């Protein structure tokens, strides 16, 4: 089942609903990464960027990946583990996307790229954890990054920063194991 898996899928749907009623821009003004240093103390923004989606294929594609991989981490390593991966990856993939291309980005695939990174590496270095990423998916993941380099209009810094975060954490966690 997974409480931290469902809470995030419900948050993303609640916020998507609001973007349909109020328009994208109206939600963006309030949930996006701070665009002005004066707003730096609006702490929610460092995380809230991750809840915003721009089409139905955007949310569905993301929530599917979140369910498959997020649910697997939560099931085997617990709710606390998936919380910490989510918070650290959302903050850092946000920070890198803002530097690459400014603050107008949104979506969960920064968290998703860190999950792909964590589940793959953790499954190779600590097979006993009981999670893993299939080879057929580590290829789709890699095609997905590079298809963003050569363009749609993806947040490329989010993708690469997320991936990096998730490898790092999976490495650290495959020492302590």
């Amino acid at each position: 089942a997974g409480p931290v898996t469902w809470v995030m899928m419900i948050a993303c749907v609640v916020v998507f609903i609001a973007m349909q009623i109020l328009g994208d821009q109206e939600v963006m003004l309030w949930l996006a990464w701070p665009f002005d240093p004066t707003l730096k103390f609006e702490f929610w923004r460092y995380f809230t960027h991750a809840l915003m989606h721009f089409s139905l294929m955007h949310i569905l594609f993301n929530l599917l990946w979140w369910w498959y991989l997020g649910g697997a981490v939560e099931k085997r390593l617990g709710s606390g583990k998936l919380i910490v991966i989510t918070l650290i990856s959302a903050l850092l993939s946000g920070y890198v996307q803002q530097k690459f291309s400014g603050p107008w980005f949104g979506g969960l695939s920064g968290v998703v790229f860190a999950l792909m990174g964590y589940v793959w590496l953790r499954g190779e270095r600590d097979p006993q954890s009981g999670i893993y990423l299939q080879r057929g998916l580590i290829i789709f993941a890699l095609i997905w990054i590079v298809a963003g380099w050569f363009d749609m209009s993806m947040a490329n810094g989010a993708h690469i920063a997320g991936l990096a975060v998730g490898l790092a954490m999976a490495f650290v966690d495959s020492l302590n194991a």
């Binding site: 994208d24 963006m28 991750a50 989606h53 721009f54 955007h58 993301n62 993939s93 996307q97 291309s101 107008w104 980005f105 949104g106 979506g107 969960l108 695939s109 920064g110 998703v112 997905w144 963003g148 749609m152 209009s153 993806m154 947040a155 490329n156 989010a158 993708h159 997320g162």
Partner: peptide, 5 residues
């Protein structure tokens, strides 16, 4: 705007 993706 850029999608995370």
């Amino acid at each position: 705007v850029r999608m995370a993706a």
